[model samples]
Target: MGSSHHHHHHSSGLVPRGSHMGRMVNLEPDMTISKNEMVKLLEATQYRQVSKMTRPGEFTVQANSIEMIRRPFDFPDSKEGQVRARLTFDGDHLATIVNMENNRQFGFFRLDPR
Candidate 1:
C-alpha cells in the first residue's frame, strides 16, 4: 500500500463544468439573461450565497444590483479577497457589469436566455 499505485484519484471523465473549461462566446452589452441562467453563472464561478455573503464565493441580488464575488473557489482550497462585481440590469438586458474593487466597467457576462 506504499506505492503510488495505491493512491486513488481519477478525473471523472465528464466534461468539466465552468467558464474556464468552456468555449468563449461574445458578450454583447445588450445581451439579456434569465434568472435560472444567472444562478448557473454564479455556480460556475463557485459562488454560494449566505445571509450576508461577506466574502468570496458568496452573493446577494438586490433591487439595484446582483452583487457577487468574482473569484472561483478551487475544489479543495478556496481563497478570499472580497473581489466583487455589481451587476445592473435594464429591463431584460444587462446594462452594466462593474468591478467593485476598482469601480471600473468590465462588461463580462452574457446572460441566460430562458
Candidate 2:
C-alpha cells in the first residue's frame, strides 16, 4: 500500500439492505484529492445505495499527498463532533455540507439494484 492509504483495522461494519448516505472526510496532515473529483465521483455514483458492501471496505484517499486511510463504517444520525456531508447529485455540480459523521448507513439501492 502507498503512503496515500494506511490500513485502518478498527472493526467491521454492516451495511443494512437499504439505502444509505454519508461522506468521507480528509483528516490527513497533508495530501488530498480535489473537492471537484470528490463531488464528481460521488455524483457519478449518485445517491443510489450500495447493493452490497464489505465490512472493512476502502476509505482510501489522499489529501495533499498525505495518506488517505479508509476508516470505513456506518453513518450516524444527528451527532456532535465528526464531519459528514450528505451528498446529492442530479448532475450539473451538486451541493453538500461540511464534515458530518454517521454511525449507521445502508448500501442497498433497491430490493435488487445489485
Candidate 1 ranges beyond 4 A from true positions: 1-28, 48-51, 74-82, 109-114
Estimated TM-score for each candidate: 0.54, 0.21
lDDT of 2 by residue, 69-105 (tens): 1232233531222222323222322222222244223
Best by lDDT: 1
Relative to the true structure, how large is the alpha-carbon lDDT of every model? Answer: 0.53, 0.27
Give candidate 2 regions above 4 Å deviation: 1-36, 39-49, 54-85, 97-114
